[PDB]
Design an enzyme around this catalytic site. Structure first.
Site, PDB file in Angstrom:
ATOM      1  N   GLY A  82       3.243  -6.748   5.790  1.00  0.00           N
ATOM      2  CA  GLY A  82       3.399  -8.127   5.384  1.00  0.00           C
ATOM      3  C   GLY A  82       3.925  -8.253   3.971  1.00  0.00           C
ATOM      4  O   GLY A  82       4.961  -8.883   3.741  1.00  0.00           O
ATOM      5  N   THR A  83       3.218  -7.655   3.012  1.00  0.00           N
ATOM      6  CA  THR A  83       3.658  -7.721   1.623  1.00  0.00           C
ATOM      7  C   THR A  83       4.963  -6.963   1.428  1.00  0.00           C
ATOM      8  O   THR A  83       5.928  -7.503   0.875  1.00  0.00           O
ATOM      9  CB  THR A  83       2.576  -7.162   0.701  1.00  0.00           C
ATOM     10  OG1 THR A  83       1.338  -7.844   0.940  1.00  0.00           O
ATOM     11  CG2 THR A  83       2.970  -7.338  -0.757  1.00  0.00           C
TER      12      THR A  83
ATOM     13  N   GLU B 116      27.469   6.906  -9.737  1.00  0.00           N
ATOM     14  CA  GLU B 116      28.265   7.828  -8.934  1.00  0.00           C
ATOM     15  C   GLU B 116      27.763   7.889  -7.500  1.00  0.00           C
ATOM     16  O   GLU B 116      28.563   8.041  -6.567  1.00  0.00           O
ATOM     17  CB  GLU B 116      28.232   9.221  -9.558  1.00  0.00           C
ATOM     18  CG  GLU B 116      29.015   9.330 -10.846  1.00  0.00           C
ATOM     19  CD  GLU B 116      28.986  10.726 -11.431  1.00  0.00           C
ATOM     20  OE1 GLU B 116      29.598  11.636 -10.834  1.00  0.00           O
ATOM     21  OE2 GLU B 116      28.355  10.912 -12.491  1.00  0.00           O
TER      22      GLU B 116
ATOM     23  N   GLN C  37       0.824  -1.204   0.000  1.00  0.00           N
ATOM     24  CA  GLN C  37       0.000   0.000   0.000  1.00  0.00           C
ATOM     25  C   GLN C  37       0.860   1.256   0.000  1.00  0.00           C
ATOM     26  O   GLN C  37       0.607   2.197  -0.765  1.00  0.00           O
ATOM     27  CB  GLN C  37      -0.933  -0.013   1.210  1.00  0.00           C
ATOM     28  CG  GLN C  37      -1.780   1.233   1.349  1.00  0.00           C
ATOM     29  CD  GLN C  37      -3.104   0.967   2.033  1.00  0.00           C
ATOM     30  OE1 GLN C  37      -3.250  -0.005   2.771  1.00  0.00           O
ATOM     31  NE2 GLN C  37      -4.079   1.832   1.789  1.00  0.00           N
ATOM     32  N   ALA C  38       1.883   1.290   0.856  1.00  0.00           N
ATOM     33  CA  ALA C  38       2.760   2.454   0.909  1.00  0.00           C
ATOM     34  C   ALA C  38       3.458   2.666  -0.425  1.00  0.00           C
ATOM     35  O   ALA C  38       3.542   3.797  -0.922  1.00  0.00           O
ATOM     36  CB  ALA C  38       3.787   2.288   2.025  1.00  0.00           C
TER      37      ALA C  38
ATOM     38  N   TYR D  10      -1.405  11.191   4.517  1.00  0.00           N
ATOM     39  CA  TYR D  10      -0.342  10.498   3.798  1.00  0.00           C
ATOM     40  C   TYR D  10      -0.028  11.139   2.452  1.00  0.00           C
ATOM     41  O   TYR D  10       1.059  10.903   1.911  1.00  0.00           O
ATOM     42  CB  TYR D  10      -0.714   9.026   3.579  1.00  0.00           C
ATOM     43  CG  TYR D  10      -0.609   8.106   4.790  1.00  0.00           C
ATOM     44  CD1 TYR D  10       0.386   8.266   5.748  1.00  0.00           C
ATOM     45  CD2 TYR D  10      -1.499   7.056   4.954  1.00  0.00           C
ATOM     46  CE1 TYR D  10       0.475   7.427   6.835  1.00  0.00           C
ATOM     47  CE2 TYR D  10      -1.413   6.207   6.040  1.00  0.00           C
ATOM     48  CZ  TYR D  10      -0.424   6.398   6.977  1.00  0.00           C
ATOM     49  OH  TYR D  10      -0.333   5.558   8.060  1.00  0.00           O
TER      50      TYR D  10
ATOM     51  N   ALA E  47      -0.939 -10.514   2.969  1.00  0.00           N
ATOM     52  CA  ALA E  47       0.082 -11.065   3.848  1.00  0.00           C
ATOM     53  C   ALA E  47      -0.270 -10.914   5.321  1.00  0.00           C
ATOM     54  O   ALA E  47       0.351 -11.581   6.154  1.00  0.00           O
ATOM     55  CB  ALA E  47       1.428 -10.399   3.569  1.00  0.00           C
TER      56      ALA E  47
END
Ligand code: TA1
Ligand code: GTP
Ligand code: ANP
Ligand code: GDP
Ligand code: MG
Lengths: 389, 451, 433
Positions: free
Chosen positions: B144-145, B254, B11-12, B224, B99
């Site tokens: 979880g995921t 670099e 989700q994030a 968020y 998850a």
């Protein structure tokens, strides 16, 4: 009531025919009550070191120095526990080890009767003492049962009926038990071994990516021993009743090694859960044993999570109270199985965890240089302090 | 062609990808439907930059993105959103459960049956690519995921491609704030893969961004979206050097060459200097010196760790806009005289500098002001150990009693996988404590022969 | 596609299920005939969670209704939403359990269980990806308790890898309606502790207190109590049906809330709750919802949390709100009432946020706690149980149906072990030897 100490034992094994034919190198070293293991792919970093109670180097069979003979292991565990059982207390052996570890050899031994396991020696000693001490007043009776635990369901190994799920009950006084579990008497240890073979024929075994025949379930062989005394009266009394339990533990599996779906993953998850709960209860019992044994204070009775699994539930009387415990772990000696071996140690480290520290293999050149430098420093200090240099 | 594949997991990751792709489309003048009217209006050009967009024959532009998640919710929000026509219809969504905050569920049980499709799509994207530079993996520790599936994906990518760089942006758990009870287990278990396989891992913290969005951009109740927009600005500052011209141009290799003294210490902090609101954009010169100083302020760090408690091992400054090299040199010289900023004695230079002409853009409806100059600073320092140490303590407080462990072992793991990971974590910490120590006094003990 | 099968057994279960299907149906815009007449489009996207799609653009719930008497079926059918259900799911017999657990579990329910399981299997085999089950029932009753426990045993046998929730109405000290409550409660919780992943704790006294004090209702009836329980039931699974900033599945709640397998008894609560006329006098914000959720008098289980410690808590917010406020409020609650939270969990607050609130309110929240105080609710029952078992007050009614005296002892022992397991964590240190 009383505590129940646990003896943690680990044993290696001499190479096998496949290992001997291949050019595989050993990786496990053992000294005193400590073992060390070297990662074959990371020789540069360090070896992992663990310290157990009991450590057994059965690698070199004809070795004369520091060879863990079978009679030594029997004297160091089984004789003491059998003596404890004779006093009228329950006792148990867990046998842990993955495929190829060599647990069966330690637990049963070879049929040639030159190298024995714990079970045959225990049975022979028990029946020898039974025949020796059977005077006019004392009577002895022995019974045997053999059950299997699979996916948190109990099954009978000796009864040839349909493999239905037996129901687990709790008698108020005699504790947990299993209904309709066939109970048979035995007169010779040959009968015990025949029943063991018959039951082992009935174990639930499935093919995995690792081995074509790997145990998918736990098994319990209970020896129930009854002593009857005839005092100088008309009253014959069953003076004590004690149990000897022989538990076979399946190993701990990873989904990566065995990626099969359906029943296989269910079996693996159940085995892992049962092993984790068993380790938790054994660790708690060892801690509670250690505390009162030195401090002699009764910290209430704590809480021991017996009910979290059927295995610990049915073995509730054997584990707890006045009893004795001992777990033996087999460690394959090759390298190909290195991670597996490490996992075994990490499971055998659990309960009665004790400090090992780091084992360092010093270079002989630097050792000799440091020793000679110290000697030169001492001699020079002695000479110059007296004004002779 | 300097081209990168962005991978978003969890989700994030998906929400940060939404913010990032909004910013990219605004930057290159691409409409939400993929068409670019600018080329038609002008006649042609390179505005279909190959870093992030592949151009088809009809004139549409498809992102070089891969989205993955085990829930359908977060990606179904994108399939029917404003940008529904921008992405290729593949989104690699497992129509099953999630998850469930369990590392084992995302790495062993349900992570399988979707990794193959993800790898196939990644291979298809890479085949179309010429002169691939690296990967940009977005995920979050504690999920979880985002932990287990990211670990599996990174392992397989390292096996397959091997030599290509793999940059990782991740949301480390905050010290005090959290949104789950089993964050420490997943965060510790991810150490194995985030250490061995990744090349450079950037960590950001939600508490730090909340603090920034309350002192700087005067917002009192952030969500968020603001965090994702700031992270998108950071990533755009990182990646601008291979899309637009500039006086000094810094590629992705670099970064690794200059910020990574040893293979096991590739965890730099990131920060953005001119985070300011439109109202306060006035009354402020916002010169190069001011933003360079603000980059080093402890309050402006994006992770809750004080740099004054450690030592700087390397720095990389990426400038955008009307920036001249002389001012950058003067600012670096001024910073080098401050006593509160300590550098390790074995890195006398300790600075990489890059300047780009393209100024930062303003997302419509955003919160950041329009500015002429900006700078993004990356800093490999020893203070990050503190940010890890707290987590380790938390892990112990849950592993002594083996709480929440049966969930993990029920999905295909074993107990030992915990302890081993913890041991590995300890090693990493000790490594940091080994590198920040000053060189021993007259490192050849003492010397001086006859003459 | 996560999907849930709903089961309701007994009078209390059927009543709560009917009210729940009216509450969920509105949220998703469903006509009592079954046609869809909503306004938003986010209402049909995840309609398959609770409803099957019929041929003529009609939606039929997955409800399964069980009983041992036809009266409650007749009451449900002759109701506002009686025609919504599929008539083939009305499984029932005659000659009800008579408030006897043995009849529900061993004699009468044993014959109807085959048909009920056939219907359940037919419903579950049509699922794209079945997630779990729900069962609404009362512990202190007859057909409800026994049939529910027997069913849960069977489904756990057949579907071991699926979640099994349960909304249980357990007996209460003062509001006691039947004389054989302790036997049924003990013999039921002996089964629920073994074969259930999550059990929610509800009793009528807490709901009556909420009605009298918070909502200031003069003459509350069972409809209100069912209305509350329905609110909690939707709020638990809100995240499965709607999008949000930070989703929370049922399995996520089970993982984050259950530290050990046998401690899965939860205290539910809902906010906001006001008394009509007072609405205009209070502003609705995240701090107000947080304050009302953690208030002792808001709980639905009649166990004071102040007498124990929270092993875990979960908060599912619904509405447009700032994540910073939610996180700061949870941290403030943890840091202020530090004595009521277990020390060996660094953070024991799960937070989930869903974007679309309930129709009619700009903000709402559901609270699911897990604390040692729940032991009290068992202890009282056990006390009453022994007060009836020493003399065998009504035991012949149970032993005449095939039960034996040993089973009561096993159930009592299991209660006592559960109570001790919860009590071990209650004391606020362990230092002395
Ligand atoms: C119009 C308006 O804003 O007034 C509110 C209202 O005044 C209050 C008092 C409502 C009102 O609720 C009650 O009076 C009540 C009575 C007995 C038991 C429970 C509630 C309301 O009826 C409840 C009703 O709630 C809903 O409509 C939600 O969708 C709710 N579902 C139902 O109430 C419902 C019942 C039957 C059929 C269809 C819907 C819900 C809440 C959470 C999760 C799912 C659904 C609302 C907004 C109100 C009134 C109308 C006064 C309250 O209830 C809820 C759950 O919102 C009681 O305290 C809260 C706070 C509200 O402010
Ligand atoms: N900065 C930022 N962090 C986020 C955002 N969304 C989620 N997170 C972080 O993600 C953590 C929760 O775990 P997730 O990454 O959402 O786990 P997941 O990707 O949903 O995978 P599952 O656990 O299986 O559902 C929280 O602690 C947040 O800090 C976001 O939009 N911005
Ligand atoms: N101490 C020992 N000395 C000599 N040989 C040993 C010793 N321990 C084990 N072995 C060898 O190990 C063989 C048996 O190994 P094996 O039966 O494969 O173990 P295992 O099947 O993996 N145990 P398990 O599968 O867990 O029941 C014997 O035939 C011996 O040759
Ligand atoms: N909330 C609620 N509780 C009820 C209702 N009807 C009965 N109860 C409770 O359930 C108990 C009686 O159980 P009962 O419903 O007769 O069980 P059954 O015979 O199996 O259906 C009483 O203690 C009541 O508190 C109802 O309509 N709503
Ligand atoms: Mg998720």
């Amino acid at each position: 009531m009383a505590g129940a100490s646990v003896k943690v034992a680990v044993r290696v094994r001499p190479f096998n025919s496949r290992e001997m034919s291949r050019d595989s190198k050993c990786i496990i070293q053992m000294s005193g009550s400590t073992t060390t293991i070297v990662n074959p792919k990371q020789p540069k970093e360090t070896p992992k070191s663990f310290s157990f109670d009991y450590s057994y180097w059965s690698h070199t069979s004809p070795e004369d120095i520091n060879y863990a003979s079978q009679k030594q292991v029997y004297r160091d565990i089984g004789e003491e526990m059998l003596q404890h059982a004779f006093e009228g207390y329950n006792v148990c052996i867990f046998a842990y080890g993955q495929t190829g570890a060599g647990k069966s050899y330690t637990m049963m031994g070879k049929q040639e009767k030159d190298q024995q396991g714990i079970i045959p020696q225990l049975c022979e000693d028990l029946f020898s003492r039974i025949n020796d001490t059977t005077n006019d007043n004392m009577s002895y009776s022995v019974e045997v049962s053999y059950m299997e635990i699979y996916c948190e369901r109990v099954r009978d190994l000796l009864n040839p009926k349909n493999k239905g799920n037996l129901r687990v009950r709790e008698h108020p006084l005699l504790g947990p038990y299993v209904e309709d579990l066939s109970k048979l008497a035995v007169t010779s240890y040959n009968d015990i071994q025949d029943l063991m073979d018959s039951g082992n024929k009935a174990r639930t075994v499935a093919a995995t990516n690792m081995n074509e025949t790997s145990s998918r379930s736990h098994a319990v062989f209970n020896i129930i021993f009854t002593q009857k005394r005839h005092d100088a009266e008309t009253n014959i009394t069953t003076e004590k009743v004690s149990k000897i339990s022989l538990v076979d533990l399946a190993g701990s599996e990873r989904a990566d090694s065995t990626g099969a779906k359906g029943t296989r993953l269910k079996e693996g998850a159940n085995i892992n859960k049962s092993l984790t709960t068993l380790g938790k209860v054994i660790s708690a019992l060892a801690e509670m044993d250690s505390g009162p044994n030195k401090n002699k204070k009764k910290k209430k009775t704590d809480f021991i999570p017996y009910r979290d699994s059927v295995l610990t539930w049915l073995l509730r009387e054997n584990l707890g109270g006045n009893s004795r415990t001992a777990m033996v772990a087999a460690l394959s000696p090759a390298d190909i199985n290195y991670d597996e071996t490490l996992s075994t140690l990490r499971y055998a480290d659990r309960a009665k965890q004790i400090r090992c520290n780091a084992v360092i293999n010093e270079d002989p050149n630097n050792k000799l240089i440091r020793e000679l430098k110290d000697e030169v420093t001492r001699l020079r200090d002695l000479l110059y302090a007296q004004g002779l240099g | 062609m300097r081209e990168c594949i962005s991978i978003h997991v969890g989700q994030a990751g998906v929400q940060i990808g939404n913010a990032c792709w909004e910013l990219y489309c605004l930057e290159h003048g691409i409409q939400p439907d993929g068409q670019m009217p600018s080329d038609k209006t002008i006649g042609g050009g390179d505005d279909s930059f190959n870093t992030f967009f592949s151009e088809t024959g009809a004139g549409k532009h498809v992102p070089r993105a891969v989205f993955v998640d085990l829930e359908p919710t977060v990606i179904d929000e994108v399939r029917t959103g404003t940008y529904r026509q921008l992405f290729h219809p593949e989104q690699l969504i497992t129509g099953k459960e999630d998850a469930a905050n369990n590392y084992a569920r995302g790495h062993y049980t349900i992570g399988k049956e979707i990794i193959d499709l993800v790898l196939d799509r990644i291979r298809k994207l890479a085949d179309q690519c010429t002169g691939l530079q690296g990967f940009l993996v977005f995920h979050s520790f504690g999920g979880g995921t985002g932990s287990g599936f990211t670990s599996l994906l990174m392992e397989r990518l390292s096996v397959d491609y091997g030599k290509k760089s793999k940059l990782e942006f991740s949301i480390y758990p905050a010290p005090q704030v959290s949104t789950a009870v089993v964050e420490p287990y997943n965060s510790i278990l991810t150490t194995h893969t985030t250490l061995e396989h990744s090349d450079c891992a950037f960590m950001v913290d939600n508490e730090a961004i909340y603090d920034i969005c309350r002192r700087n951009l005067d917002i009192e109740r952030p969500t968020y979206t603001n965090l994702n927009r700031l992270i998108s600005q950071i990533v755009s500052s990182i990646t601008a050097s291979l899309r637009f011209d500039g006086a000094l141009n810094v590629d992705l290799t670099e970064f690794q060459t200059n910020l990574v003294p040893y293979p096991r210490i590739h965890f730099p902090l990131a920060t953005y200097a001119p985070v300011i609101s439109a109202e306060k954009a006035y009354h402020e010169q916002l010169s190069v010196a001011e933003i360079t100083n603000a980059c080093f302020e402890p309050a402006n760090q994006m992770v809750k760790c004080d740099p004054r408690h450690g030592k700087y091992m390397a720095c990389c400054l990426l400038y955008r806009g009307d920036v001249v090299p002389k001012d950058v040199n003067a600012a670096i010289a001024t910073i080098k005289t401050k006593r509160s900023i300590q550098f390790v004695d074995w890195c006398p230079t300790g600075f990489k500098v890059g300047i780009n002409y393209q100024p930062p853009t303003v997302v419509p409806g955003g919160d950041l002001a329009k500015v002429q100059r900006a700078v993004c600073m990356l800093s490999n320092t020893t203070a990050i150990a503190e940010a890890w140490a707290r987590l380790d303590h938390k892990f112990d407080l849950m592993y002594a009693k083996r709480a929440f462990v049966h969930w993990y072992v029920g999905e295909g793991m074993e107990e030992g996988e915990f302890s081993e990971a913890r041991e590995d974590m300890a090693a990493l910490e000790k490594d940091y404590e080994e590198v920040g120590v000053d060189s021993v006094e007259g490192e050849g003990e003492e010397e001086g022969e006859e003459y | 596609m996560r999907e849930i099968v709903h089961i309701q057994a007994g009078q209390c279960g059927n009543q709560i299920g009917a009210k729940f299907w009216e509450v969920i149906s509105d949220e998703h815009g469903i006509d009592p005939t079954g046609s869809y007449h909503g306004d938003s489009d986010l209402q049909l996207e995840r309609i398959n969670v609770y409803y099957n799609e019929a041929t003529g653009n009609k939606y039929v719930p997955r409800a399964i209704l069980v009983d041992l008497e036809p009266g409650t079926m007749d009451s449900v059918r002759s109701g506002p939403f009686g025609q919504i259900f599929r008539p083939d799911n009305f499984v029932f017999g005659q000659s009800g359990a008579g408030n006897n657990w043995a009849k529900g579990h061993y004699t009468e329910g044993a014959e109807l269980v085959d048909s009920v399981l056939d219907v359940v299997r037919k419903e579950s085999e049509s699922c794209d990806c079945l997630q779990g089950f729900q069962l609404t029932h009362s512990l202190g009753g007859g057909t409800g308790s026994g049939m529910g426990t027997l069913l849960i045993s069977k489904i756990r046998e057949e579907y071991p890898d699926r979640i099994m929730n349960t909304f249980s109405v357990m007996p209460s000290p003062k509001v006691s309606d039947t004389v054989v409550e302790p036997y049924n409660a003990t013999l039921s919780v002996h089964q629920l502790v073994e074969n259930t992943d999550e059990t929610y704790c509800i009793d009528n006294e807490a709901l009556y207190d909420i009605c009298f004090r918070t909502l200031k209702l003069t003459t509350p009836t069972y409809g209100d109590l069912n209305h509350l329980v329905s609110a909690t039931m939707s709020g638990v699974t809100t995240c499965l049906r709607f999008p949000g900033q930070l989703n929370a599945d049922l399995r996520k709640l089970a993982v984050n809330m259950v530290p050990f397998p046998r401690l899965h008894f939860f205290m539910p609560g809902f906010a906001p709750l006001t008394s009509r006329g007072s609405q205009q006098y209070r502003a609705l914000t995240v701090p107000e919802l947080t304050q009302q959720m953690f208030d002792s008098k808001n709980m639905m289980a009649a166990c004071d949390p102040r007498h124990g410690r929270y092993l875990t808590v979960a908060a599912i917010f619904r509405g447009r709100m700032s994540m910073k406020e939610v996180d700061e409020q949870m941290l403030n609650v943890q840091n202020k009432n530090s004595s009521y939270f277990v020390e060996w969990i660094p953070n024991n607050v799960k937070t989930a946020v869903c974007d679309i609130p309930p129709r009619g309110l700009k903000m709402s929240a559901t609270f699911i706690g897990n604390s040692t105080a729940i032991q009290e609710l068992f202890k009282r029952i056990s006390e009453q149980f022994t007060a009836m078992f020493r003399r065998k007050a009504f035991l012949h009614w149970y032993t005449g149906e095939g039960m034996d005296e040993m089973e009561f002892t096993e159930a009592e022992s299991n209660m006592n072990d559960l109570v001790s397991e919860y009590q071990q964590y209650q004391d606020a240190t362990a230092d002395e030897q």
